[PDB]
Amino acid sequence: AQPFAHLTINATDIPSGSHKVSLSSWYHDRGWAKISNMTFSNGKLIVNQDGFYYLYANICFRHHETSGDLATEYLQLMVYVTKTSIKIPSSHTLMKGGSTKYWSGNSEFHFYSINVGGFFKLRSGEEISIEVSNPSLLDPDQDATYFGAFKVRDID
Amino acid sequence: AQPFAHLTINATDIPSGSHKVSLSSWYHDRGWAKISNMTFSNGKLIVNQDGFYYLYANICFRHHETSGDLATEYLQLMVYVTKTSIKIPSSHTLMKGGSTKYWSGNSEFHFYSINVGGFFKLRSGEEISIEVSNPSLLDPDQDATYFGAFKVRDID
Amino acid sequence: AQPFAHLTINATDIPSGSHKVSLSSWYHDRGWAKISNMTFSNGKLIVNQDGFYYLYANICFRHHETSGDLATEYLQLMVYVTKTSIKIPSSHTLMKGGSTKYWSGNSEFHFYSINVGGFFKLRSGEEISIEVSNPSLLDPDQDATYFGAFKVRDID
Amino acid sequence: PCTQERHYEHLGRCCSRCEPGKYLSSKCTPTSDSVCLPCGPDEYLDTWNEEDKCLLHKVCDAGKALVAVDPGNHTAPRRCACTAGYHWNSDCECCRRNTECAPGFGAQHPLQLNKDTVCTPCLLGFFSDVFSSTDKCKPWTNCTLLGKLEAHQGTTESDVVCSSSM
Amino acid sequence: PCTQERHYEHLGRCCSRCEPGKYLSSKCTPTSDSVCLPCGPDEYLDTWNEEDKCLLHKVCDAGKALVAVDPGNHTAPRRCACTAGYHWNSDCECCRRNTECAPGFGAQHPLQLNKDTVCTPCLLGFFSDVFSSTDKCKPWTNCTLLGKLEAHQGTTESDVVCSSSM
Amino acid sequence: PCTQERHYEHLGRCCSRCEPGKYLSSKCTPTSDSVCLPCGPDEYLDTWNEEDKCLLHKVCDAGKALVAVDPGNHTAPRRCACTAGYHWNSDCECCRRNTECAPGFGAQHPLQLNKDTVCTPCLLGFFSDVFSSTDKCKPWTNCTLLGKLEAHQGTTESDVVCSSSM
Ligand SMILES: [Cl-]
Ligand SMILES: [Cl-]
Ligand SMILES: [Cl-]
Ligand SMILES: [Cl-]
Ligand SMILES: [Cl-]
Ligand SMILES: [Cl-]
Ligand SMILES: [Cl-]
Ligand SMILES: [Cl-]
Ligand SMILES: [Cl-]
Ligand SMILES: [Cl-]
Ligand SMILES: [Cl-]
Ligand SMILES: [Cl-]
Ligand SMILES: [Cl-]
Ligand SMILES: [Cl-]
Ligand SMILES: [Cl-]
Ligand SMILES: [Cl-]
Ligand SMILES: [Cl-]
Ligand SMILES: [Cl-]
Ligand SMILES: [Cl-]
Ligand SMILES: [Cl-]
Ligand SMILES: [Cl-]
Ligand SMILES: [Cl-]
Ligand code: NA
Ligand code: NA
Ligand code: NA
């Protein structure tokens, strides 16, 4: 069957505030957003078929001055790609990326992107989710903020 | 057939100036540059065979002080991976990355790299191109500035 | 057979000091670290089976103030993914990434991650290694500092 | 023999393309013509097309100082503009701060949305004593309104000076 | 009819899960029950599980101002804490500098490890003249110890003033 | 029984390796020996090899303050050097600013290309009053040339002082 997903941020429903959250709203079937033989449900990408997948994420952060002063100009912009299952209550991080930044009020616009990618063993019923540090800084563009997976080989 | 391309910047022909351009010169058959069952023509990587491909790009920017003061020390270093077809005149962005930077004249050298990657549905005759923000800052090294694609599965 | 490796940093054995080194200690069989039909030996990932592989690396750098002042606050944080063979004595760089940074003593913590990825032709007996600029700044986490490879197709 | 537009050739037969608002679900077969289906919510195609799927409307991100001037539909793209005091810059793909006109210069009016300020030198009898991206040249004060006489004349950079005699 | 915990169903039969410290090497077959093997070095599982493999203990990175309070084992996770003067922050996942109490305020005691300073206003007869994340309010000087008299009384922000008469 | 260099074993037979400037197009078969083809434009191999393909010459990027000292060819690698005032640094893989010698110290001559300045203390009768990565110690002024007498002697950090008598 050879499953895959390319999920892009749901611009309609990005969380507000500046505490780290678990991102649960993504498009699955519009623009470049697509999914086959995996399911997206309850804010999680669910693996349907055992296999080794390549997982990836691109996350973009932005701030313009018309949004007013930042709470602090000292930022740590992070992405965490985490795994859990419908069974176990806890989740564990697979990949991680980001950078501390200084975004001065002197400049009118700021931008930064994180990309992570990795090859992981996945089982039916396991669930991937994206956590980010500053929800309100997220770039709503489909070419900016996305994550995905595609099966590369069987478990055997 | 299972097509692929790994294209590295054509150090012989990097555009000058500091306005955003479409990069149309890349090696296809020297060093790590390679291509099979895709074509590179008129500055575009042309898809020959339908399929789902993983697309990626690594772009490096650099500046040394012997090149003289930057126009401005406030930079926004960006990459845009765009798609068009021999048919339609317009193009649309698939992936996007970069960061605003402050490159002070105090330090003699500055460096920054962007990496993006993504899984996309592609049809025969569709054309991928790379756009970057500061052509004259591009690192001419083959291990620094490149992009590629490889087919992972059929459309079905 | 379809070989692969996902290698994570050996937190037990990260080199000290601030000169660029070749990283030779990685887990191969614990947590997310895994390997099949490739070998890890003498600090190198050895290709066993000819093919085109996708190679990737995520490298994280960090510094906290309780470790004392940095030698200099002007950093260039780099990763080099290099290739050699049991035959030839010299090695050549395939991919490259990083950024110059200014990590002021004003802030208590600093963080930065590099990701590179690329599609390369590899032969039995060829050896991949990771070189980094500031060994003592490396993040020991398995989700932070890793590299890997998976075969995508035959040479033919 | 197919018309270049509105028609396309496949399997050696002439097939009709999809109208704007619709995408090509499946190409013509030997037994039927093209199957064209409407674009999904917030999607569009603006031409007579042979497209695999529809395009998603761009986001007029308020977080980028953007606002929609035209919302778009299944037939037309959404159009955005930089909000007041900013203009679009295609190098940063961002909403840049508008250029300030120096003293002795004023902002050309009427002020265009999404377009950068144009600066003109102040004409005789007018002046500008500020850096501003919005302000035009203001006219010199007329001293009679103040019940005073003109002491010395103004410039293009400074105002007239009024004084009361005795 | 399987017990929700300690048991799992597979191939229509009831199979025993793996005890903490062990992972599921292979599921029960028609001929045998589950095969459960011990976790590898520095690995663990803390529940009755059906897991493919064991979890690796987190690193209490000294480079992050972290130290282990509980080392963990094959049965339990390792526990880390921010070293003195720092507290864990779940937004940065980092060891943040503890909040300083202003003058007129002192640090609540006893001081908790890995937890941020709590600031209380100084009570009458006590004062604090510094920003400090550690210092509580100190009591006013008693002038008799200095062989002097109280000139003027202190505040919550400043100390008493002693003077020698004649 | 194959010679370790210039020869390689394959299919149990002794096969000749490719000469520098050529790569191994295809290994020896049961019917023929190795097929070795010349390196492509701007490519090279410097040893007797069994290589899949040739290496691409490094770029002596002027943008990195680099310049070629040896252009290389199909047989030899290209060699680069940092331009004047800079030296190669293998930690940054970049052209670093040369170390300045303090006052009382001069730059060792002759100055090496691509190598950092070495600083030596000035010898008696010589001085240096600047931070410079290029300047050696200059000799004290001789007052007779100025038609004057030596008032006070110089140091390694400052020059002699000349005065006119009467
Ligand atoms: Cl959707
Ligand atoms: Cl960065
Ligand atoms: Cl920083
Ligand atoms: Cl600015
Ligand atoms: Cl895994
Ligand atoms: Cl080429
Ligand atoms: Cl910035
Ligand atoms: Cl410096
Ligand atoms: Cl797509
Ligand atoms: Cl291991
Ligand atoms: Cl920098
Ligand atoms: Cl701070
Ligand atoms: Cl290659
Ligand atoms: Cl649009
Ligand atoms: Cl946009
Ligand atoms: Cl502008
Ligand atoms: Cl743990
Ligand atoms: Cl941690
Ligand atoms: Cl805090
Ligand atoms: Cl070379
Ligand atoms: Cl180089
Ligand atoms: Cl140096
Ligand atoms: Na003005
Ligand atoms: Na205090
Ligand atoms: Na000197």
Author numbering:
A (entry chain A), B (entry chain A), C (entry chain A): 162 to 317
D (entry chain R), E (entry chain R), F (entry chain R): 34 to 199
The authors write:
RANKL (the receptor activator of the nuclear factor kappa-B ligand, also named as TNFRSF11, TRANCE and ODF) and its receptor RANK (the receptor activator of the nuclear factor kappa-B) are essential for the development and activation of osteoclasts, and therefore play important roles in regulating bone remodeling. RANKL is a member of the tumor necrosis factor (TNF) cytokine family and was cloned by four different groups. The functional receptor for RANKL, RANK, is a member of the TNF receptor (TNFR) family. When interaction with the ligands, three separated RANK extracellular regions bind along the clefts formed between neighboring monomers of a RANKL homotrimer, leading to the assembly of three RANK cytoplasmic regions.
A crystal of mRANK/mRANKL was crushed and seeded into a solution containing purified mRANK and hRANKL and crystals were obtained. The final refined model contains residues of 35–199 of mRANK and 162–317 of hRANKL. Similar to the complexes of mRANKL-mRANK and other classical TNF-TNFR family members, hRANKL and mRANK form a biological hetero-hexameric complex with one receptor binding along each of the three clefts between neighboring monomers of the ligand homotrimer. The 90% identity of RANKL ectodomain (residues 162–317 of hRANKL and residues 161–316 of mRANKL) between Homo sapiens and Mus musculus indicates, there is no significant structural difference between the hRANKL-mRANK and mRANKL-mRANK complexes. The critical residues in mRANKL involved in the mRANKL-mRANK interactions such as His-179, Lys-180, Gly-191, Arg-222, Glu-225, Asn-266, Glu-268, Lys-281, Arg-283, Asp-299 and Asp-301 are all conserved in hRANKL and make similar interactions to mRANK. For the hRANKL-mRANK complex, the corresponding residues (Arg-223 and Asp-300) in hRANKL form similar salt bridges with Asp-94 and Lys-97 in mRANK, indicating its important role in hRANKL-mRANK interaction. Considering the important roles of Arg223 and Asp300, a set of hRANKL mutants, including Arg223Ala (223 M), Asp300Ala (300 M) and Arg223Ala plus Asp300Ala (223 + 300 M) were generated to screen for hRANKL mutants that lack osteoclast-stimulating activity. Biacore analyses showed that hRANKL has a comparable binding affinity for mRANK (Kd 1.56 × 10−10 M) to mRANKL (Kd of 6.8 × 10−11 M). Mutants 223 M and 300 M exhibited 20-fold and 70-fold decreased affinity mRANK while the double mutant 223 + 300 M exhibited a larger, 260-fold, decrease in Kd.
